[PDB]
From a paper:
RNase E is an essential bacterial endoribonuclease involved in the turnover of messenger RNA and the maturation of structured RNA precursors in Escherichia coli. The N-terminal half forms the catalytic domain (residues 1–530), resembles its paralog RNase G, and is relatively conserved among prokaryotes (Marcaida et al., 2006). The RNase E catalytic domain forms a dimer of dimers, with a quaternary organization resembling two pairs of scissors arranged in tandem. Between these two domains is a pair of conserved CPxCxGxG motifs, one on each monomer, that coordinate a single zinc ion.
Quaternary flexibility is also suggested by a second RNase E structure that we have solved to 3.5 Å and that possesses small breakdown fragments of M1 RNA. In that structure, the quaternary organization resembles the previously described holoprotein, although possessing a slight ∼10° bend, and its tertiary organization is nearly identical to that of the apoprotein. The positions of the side chains of several residues in both structures are not certain because of the poor quality of the electron density maps. Quaternary structural adjustments may occur in the binding of intricately folded RNAs, such as M1 RNA. However, the complex between the N-terminal catalytic half of RNase E and M1 RNA has one tetramer per RNA component under saturating conditions, as shown by native gel electrophoresis mobility shift assays and by nondissociating mass spectrometry (P. Ilag et al., personal communication). A bent tetramer may explain this observed 1:1 ratio of stoichiometry of tetramer to RNA.
Author numbering: 1 to 32, 35 to 79, 87 to 308, 314 to 393, 402 to 404, 407, 412 to 436, 441 to 489, ...
The structure:
Amino acid sequence: MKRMLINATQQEELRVALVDGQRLYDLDIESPEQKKANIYKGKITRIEPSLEAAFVDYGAERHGFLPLKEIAREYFPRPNIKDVLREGQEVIVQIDKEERGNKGAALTTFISLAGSYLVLMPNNPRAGGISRRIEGDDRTELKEALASLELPEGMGLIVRTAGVGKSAEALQWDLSFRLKHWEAIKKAAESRPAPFLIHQESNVIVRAFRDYLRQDIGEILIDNPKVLELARQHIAALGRPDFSSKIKLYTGEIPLFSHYQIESQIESAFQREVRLPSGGSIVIDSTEALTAIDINSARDIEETAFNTNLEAADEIARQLRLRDLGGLIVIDFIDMTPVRHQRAVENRLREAVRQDRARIQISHISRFGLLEMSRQRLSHVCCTVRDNESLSLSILRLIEEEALKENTAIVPVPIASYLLNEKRSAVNAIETRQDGVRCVIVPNDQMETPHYHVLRVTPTLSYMLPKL
Ligand SMILES: [Zn+2]
C-alpha cells in the first residue's frame, strides 16, 4: 500500500509525504501569496464597446476585465461586446493576470486546468500540443501517446514538460482528473447566483492533490480535523468525490510521521552521505556552481562496480526528489571498463527519474567517468586548517614584504604568541633590516586560526588597533 501522509499539527510547517509501505519516496514541505488561475462565477457589472470588453465582479473589491477576444462562443446568445454580453449576466471566469497597481485584473472565460502532466482547456479546442521545451526524441513518443488519450470533442489539450517520461496510461489518469474537476467546476456554478469562488488556484492541499494522487495511492492520512475537512471540500471541488472515502483522520498519540517511521529518512535528505543497499554509499557535496555526487563501494571487481553504480542510480534519483536539488548535477560513478555497463548505468538513471515531476536531462559518461545532468527546480561555510606554525611563517613573510615597500598584523591569539616569541628574532630582524619600520603584531581574541589582516601604513595603542 502506497499512502499520502499529511502532517499539520505544526502551524509553521505543513508536510506531505508519499510513502510506499514505510519507505518514503517523495516529500513536500510548505511553510508560511499570489491570486492567479483562480476560477470564479462572476456577474457582468458593465460593458464597454469603447474597449471591446466588459467588467466582471468575481467577488474582489475590484472588478475584473474581460476582453472580447476572451468571450467563448458558449456565452454568445467581428462583433461589438454590446451584442454579446448583457449586464448582470453570469459567466465562468479564470484570472489571466493579477491585480496591478490600481484595480486591474485580466480575466478569461477560456478556462484552463493545469495538472501534473496535462493542461486541459475544456473551453477551446483551438489550443493544444506538446510543451515547447520538449525536443526531437523526447517528444516523439508523446505526440503518439498524446493522440491515444480520449479527449471530449469541444476541448483541446496540452502536454506539459513533466509529461516527458510518463506512460499513455498515466497520461490517461491525468486527463480524467482534469475532466472530473471541470465537471465539478461548471456544476458548482450552475447551482448558484453571481459571483463567487470555485477553484483556489494554489493552496497547498489543492497542489498535493493535483500533483500527487495516482491511482496506486490507497489512503490519505491527515493528522488535523480542521485540515481534513478542508481536504474533503478540496477533493470534491477537485472533481473526484471518490477519494473522499479514502481520506482518514489520524488519531494516534504518536505523531503521524513518527508512527510510519519517516521522520528519520526525511532527515536523510539533509545527510551528506547515504548508504546504498549493498553497503556502498553516495556522497552529495554542493558547491557554488553545481551539485557533485561521488560513489564509493561497500566493503568480482567489475560486477561490484556495476552493481554499486546501479544501486547508486536509484538512490541518486530519489535523493534528487527529496532534496529538491536544482540545476547542474555531476555524478562520479565508479569506473567501469565495459562500455555497456556505462550504457546500462546511464539508462537506469534515465529510468529512475522517469517518475520525478521536474524536467531532467542526462548526458553520457564522459571519458573522465563523469555524468553531467540537470534538473529543473520545483522549489554555508565554516576552509583542512593551516597549522599555526605554517600560518605564522606565512604571515611573517607577508609582513616582511609590506615592510620593504617604499613609503611604508592583526592575527588570532596563538598566532601572535607564536610570532612574538617563537619568531621574535625574525620579527626583530625585519625592523632592523627595514630601518624605521614598526612591525605591530597585535593578538585579537575576536579572530582565530583561519583569519588575519596585514595592513600597511597615529599614536594608537597596539591593543586598540583592531578596533581602529
Ligand atoms: Zn570547516
